[PDB]
């Protein structure tokens, strides 16, 4: 069986160079991103005023059209520039500057990856972005700030053409994933180390994508617990690092060498925040 020390070594030795990364909800825990399933949080109570068939309706269309506000209360809350990224994101970015990040796939819609300084050439925001939008009728792309003005002031924006409701480019149920997800196919075979952090591997196709990388590719899970297929039938080259995702990450960071360089980077980056 492998271990953190082991994986560390392969990254240093330069025998891992082609690192694909899967993040979900847990990387953007330490940054503050409140869950609307968990009570006791601005967002939770705010979304209770609106009566809601069931939590998912927030990301269903037919409902959205019957009443957006629930979705928008959330948009307002996550709109760029109210949540810093944390150390988990800033490693991923360091991973990048070291020439190692093949691609980073995320089920998160906080865009904390971008704001951490990862170029979007490297990201695949599989559940969408807030940085754009689209009249639900008369069809036009709109940049993100174009509507922000309203979003912060609680109003539900319209196209200056349709007057149809402009909707941020969060993927809703019933729709298929961003086109961008077509790398699904090249990235995974091209990967020589898969890195799974802060995800429960529960939503599709992330469950599936973990079994994509080749047979002999190690999967370093860093999570509160062991999940998905890494649990339900693991591979010899899997190595789990259970625990807080940060005391996971900063552990690795040392094993490799970069405790220093990490701090340096977090300095430049939160002097600009
Ligand atoms: N920040 C966000 O954008 C955000 C927030 C909440 C939910 N989501 C959605 C929820 C889901 C994302 O991934 P998903 O697999 O579903 O997340 P999940 O919320 O269902 O699971 C999170 C996983 O991480 C583990 N975990 C959570 N926090 C930590 C932590 N702080 N340290 C170590 N381990 C932790 C937890 O056990 C679980 O296995 C998608 O539907 C997202 O769109 C996104
Ligand atoms: O309860 C939360 N998350 C989910 C839990 C279970 C199942 C689905 C989603 C869930 C689904 N979903 C979609 C839609 N899906 C896209 C992919 N296939 C089609 C459907 C876009 S974002 C999102 N989360 C949840 C989600 N986002 C949050 C964001 C900020 C704060 C708290 C949040 N809590
Ligand atoms: Zn329009």
Query: Which residue in the block uniquely carries the two structure tokens 């990235």?
Result: 187
Helix, strand, coil percent values for the chain (each to nearest 5) = 40, 15, 45
Select from 3.40.250.10, 1.10.3720.10, 3.30.1600.10, 3.40.50.970 the CATH code of 30-85+127-178.
3.30.1600.10
* Architecture of the domain made up of 1-29+86-126+179-273: 3-Layer(aba) Sandwich (3.40)
Report which protein residue has its CA nearest ligand 2's atom 20: 173
**CA 14 to CA 257: how far, in whole Å?**
13
What token pair was written down for 88?
């988990």
Backbone angles phi, psi at 269, to 5 degrees: -80, -25
66, 96, 127, 184: the active-site residue: 127
Q: How remote is the CA of residue 235 from the centroid of ligand 2, in Å? A: 29
**CA 166 to CA 130: how far, in whole Å?**
12
Contact (Cβ atoms closer than 8 angstroms) between residue 114 and residue 131: yes
**CA 145 to CA 177: how far, in whole Å?**
23
Q: How remote is the CA of residue 159 from the centroid of ligand 3, in Å? A: 4
Count Cβ atoms below 10 Å from residue 172 Cβ, excluding itself. Answer: 17
Q: 44 among the known binding-site residues?
A: yes
Alpha-carbon distances, residue 16 vs 100, 144, 206, 262 (angstroms): 8, 36, 22, 19
**CA 239 to CA 124: how far, in whole Å?**
24
Crossing angle, helix 145-152 and helix 69-78, to 10 degrees? 110
| Residues 6+ positions from 79 with CB-CB distance below 8 Å | 130, 144, 148, 151, 152
**CA 212 to CA 206: how far, in whole Å?**
10
DSSP state, residue 176: P
Q: State which H helix or E strand residue 22 sits in.
A: strand 19-23
Contact (Cβ atoms closer than 8 angstroms) between residue 48 and residue 264: no
Ligand 1: nearest atom to the Cα of 35: 6
**Resolution of this entry, Å:** 3.2
Ligand 1: nearest atom to the Cα of 225: 37
């Amino acid at each position: 069986k492998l271990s953190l020390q082991d994986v560390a070594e392969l990254i240093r030795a330069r025998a891992c160079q082609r690192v694909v990364v899967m993040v979900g909800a847990g990387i953007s825990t330490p940054s503050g991103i409140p869950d609307f399933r968990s009570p006791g949080s601005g967002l939770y109570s705010n979304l209770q005023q609106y009566d809601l068939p069931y939590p998912e309706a927030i990301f269903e269309l037919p409902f959205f059209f019957h009443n957006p506000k629930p979705f928008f209360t959330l948009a307002k809350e996550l709109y760029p520039g109210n949540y810093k990224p944390n150390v988990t994101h800033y490693f991923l970015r360091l991973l990048h500057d070291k020439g190692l990040l093949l691609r980073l796939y995320t089920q998160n819609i906080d865009g904390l990856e971008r704001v951490s300084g990862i170029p979007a050439s490297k990201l695949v925001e599989a559940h969408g972005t807030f940085a754009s939008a689209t009249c639900t009728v008369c069809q036009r792309p709109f940049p993100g700030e174009d509507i922000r003005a309203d979003v912060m002031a609680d109003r539900v924006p319209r196209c200056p053409v349709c007057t149809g409701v402009v909707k941020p480019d969060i993927v809703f149920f019933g729709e298929p994933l961003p086109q961008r997800f077509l790398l699904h196919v090249v990235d995974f075979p091209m990967a020589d180390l898969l890195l799974i952090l802060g995800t429960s591997l529960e939503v599709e196709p992330f469950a599936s994508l973990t079994e994509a990388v080749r047979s002999s590719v190690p999967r370093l899970l860093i999570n509160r617990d062991l999940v998905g297929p890494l649990a339900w039938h693991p591979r010899s080259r899997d190595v789990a690092q259970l625990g807080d995702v940060v005391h996971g990450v900063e552990s690795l960071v040392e094993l490799l060498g970069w405790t220093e360089e990490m701090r340096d980077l977090v300095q430049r980056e939160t002097g600009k925040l």
